[PDB]
């Protein structure tokens, strides 16, 4: 048997975080109070602008529907 | 770049076909007027009962959302 996974590449979008949030790539704070970084619209990964260049494109999540 | 695909295993359900439908595995008609075969709830593959055990479990389709 297998989980069903959605498998593609990240789709990052600039995001306003309402609480202090860290980069899921590098571990440093997403600095500031607005437009602090990017969130993948598919898997929710949060990254700095600079870290968008550094993450693997692979984007997977388990479909729990 | 990558398509987004849903990737899991088939989820076959006994199906009452309304029009003449063929087995996507073996090519023979799904005989009868009711419960003629099984349809995968995820990818739509149609199979005879006997062909359910002959198909690969792999079930993928492109997410066009
Ligand atoms: Zn992602
Ligand atoms: Zn970072
Ligand atoms: Zn399937
Ligand atoms: Zn068949």
UniProtKB/Swiss-Prot annotation, chains A, B:
A zinc finger (Phorbol-ester/DAG-type) spans 10-59. It comes from the Eukaryota. This is Protein kinase C delta type regulatory subunit. The chain holds residues 231 to 280 of 674 of the full protein.
């Amino acid at each position: 048997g297998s989980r069903r996974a959605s498998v593609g590449s990240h789709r990052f979008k600039v995001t306003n975080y309402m609480s202090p949030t860290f980069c899921d790539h590098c571990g440093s704070l997403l600095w500031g109070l607005v437009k602090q970084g990017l969130k993948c619209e598919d898997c929710g990964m949060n990254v700095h602008h600079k870290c968008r260049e550094k993450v693997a494109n692979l984007c997977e999540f388990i479909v729990t529907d």
